[PDB]
Design an enzyme around this catalytic site. Structure first.
Site, mmCIF file in Angstrom:
data_model
loop_
_atom_site.group_PDB
_atom_site.id
_atom_site.type_symbol
_atom_site.label_atom_id
_atom_site.label_comp_id
_atom_site.label_asym_id
_atom_site.label_seq_id
_atom_site.Cartn_x
_atom_site.Cartn_y
_atom_site.Cartn_z
ATOM 1 N N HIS A 143 25.900 83.882 -19.185
ATOM 2 C CA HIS A 143 25.754 85.269 -18.759
ATOM 3 C C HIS A 143 26.972 85.794 -18.014
ATOM 4 C CE1 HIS A 143 24.219 82.896 -15.295
ATOM 5 N NE2 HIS A 143 24.848 83.824 -14.597
ATOM 6 N N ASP A 165 22.442 77.699 -21.216
ATOM 7 C CA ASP A 165 23.201 78.860 -20.732
ATOM 8 C C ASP A 165 24.596 78.470 -20.242
ATOM 9 O OD1 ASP A 165 20.919 80.248 -21.359
ATOM 10 O OD2 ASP A 165 20.280 80.553 -19.283
ATOM 11 N N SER A 186 27.649 82.396 -9.452
ATOM 12 C CA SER A 186 26.662 81.672 -10.247
ATOM 13 C C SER A 186 27.304 80.617 -11.126
ATOM 14 C CB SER A 186 25.859 82.626 -11.116
ATOM 15 O OG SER A 186 26.683 83.233 -12.096
#
EC number: 3.4.21.90
Lengths: 51, 158, 158, 158
Positions: free
Chosen positions: D35, D57, D109
């Site tokens: 992301h 991810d 993140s």
């Protein structure tokens, strides 16, 4: 008039279409230029008050 | 005062050879000279679109998300004389801008002029040449607030 | 000594991950080897168009503005021995440039051999470990002053 | 402590405006979150082909030559207790990773979670607010050494 003379009438109507297209385009160009040159004095100064 | 405040506010423009101009963030907008060519640094601020005001010899655009702490508000109020500057001090006698001869030059097109309170008052674009007090061709703001272009005779843009 | 002397003049060549060679600024000439592959650093001395040699295994060009700092005089006036170097001291005994064992590896195929007065004498290209002590294939200048190559047997570029 | 070890190993990614998530290099493999968009700062590993692992991810790829000084060894041995962290301290009570309340936010993140001796045991993707001591979704390794995810509740992926 097209059944009378085809070539003369098609070139007259092509000329009319070209004239109205160029007129509309030029009017839009001058309108856009005027708006551009009247908002650039006030876009560069936010704190100023637009009359 | 002036050197500390102009730090991280005057963003140099590079023509891939050297610094050749300064782009200034004032009033929530970026503006740079037209006649300077190259790539602005600060790649966050290099990616914004700049629209051309050829009347005032500028490209201006909306700044990114950094609203707060990057305003650098301008002042239309112009008391005459004794203004600070990046390369020294300028003067506002008789509605013009005068500097000691020899300052400025090529590569210094776009530095701002700050007041005593630090607010920007003028962004130069070029300069004329008088024998002692060199003149400056500049984008300022009028007494009504509308932006104006004060250019003396023979203003070399460099 | 020579480490500070050739600094800011011996520009390294990138292998895109590390340094695989050095480039020299000699007489306004950007001298870099051809077997040293990759991209030269900076931007003032990187965007120029270089011309291959392929007989001396160098490539040359010109600097646009750096002539004020492109100060590395080449000199063929060369007494036999006791010359400084990037790493140590090189010896020109028996008309041959000689170095002790071991020193010299990948990333060190383009740096100059300086004089006692900071003058470029040789540009190293490769070497061979044989005889009494190891020797270097290197581009130099002869007595008449024309560019000459001196190469041992089996002198692969280190 | 953890900041010193994670320095020059954890490479942030900018969206061309600002940082939006770090990218880690573990076991000789670059990996960044799916992301997180934008290019990475270190240009040597910005051109490596990255394979998608959209179940986890993460984009992953092999570093060219940075096997040492970017090793950052990982082990699956995770005894319960306290672990050091980029911001503060994390704990592995009841088979889950929980951070304090306010810490953690958008653009942060990709941060690894290290051990007492400096071994990464976890790669942060997002997190959810479980009252005080909020837990966080994370890519870890089980007892057999096989990569697994830990996504508790409606963890908003920052």
């Amino acid at each position: 008039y097209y059944h009378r003379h085809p070539v003369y009438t098609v070139i007259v109507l092509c000329g009319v279409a070209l004239a109205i297209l160029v007129g509309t385009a030029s009017s839009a160009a001058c309108i856009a230029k005027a708006r551009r040159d009247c908002l650039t004095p006030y876009a560069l100064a936010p704190n100023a008050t637009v009359p | 005062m002036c050197m500390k405040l102009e730090s991280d506010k005057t963003f140099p423009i590079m023509l891939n050879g050297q610094v050749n101009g300064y782009a200034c963030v004032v009033g929530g907008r970026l503006m740079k000279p037209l006649h300077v060519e190259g790539k602005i640094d600060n790649e966050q601020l290099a990616a914004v679109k700049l629209k051309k005001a050829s009347m005032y010899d500028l490209e201006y655009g909306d700044v990114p998300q950094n609203m707060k702490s990057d305003t650098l508000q301008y002042t239309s109020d112009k008391p005459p004389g004794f203004y600070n500057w990046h390369h020294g001090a300028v003067q506002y006698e008789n509605g013009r801008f005068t500097v000691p001869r020899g300052v400025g030059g090529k590569g210094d097109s776009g530095r701002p002029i700050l007041d005593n309170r630090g607010r920007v008052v003028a962004i130069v674009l070029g300069g004329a040449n008088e024998g002692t007090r060199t003149a400056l061709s500049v984008v300022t703001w009028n007494q009504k607030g509308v932006t104006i272009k004060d250019t003396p005779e023979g203003s070399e843009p460099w």
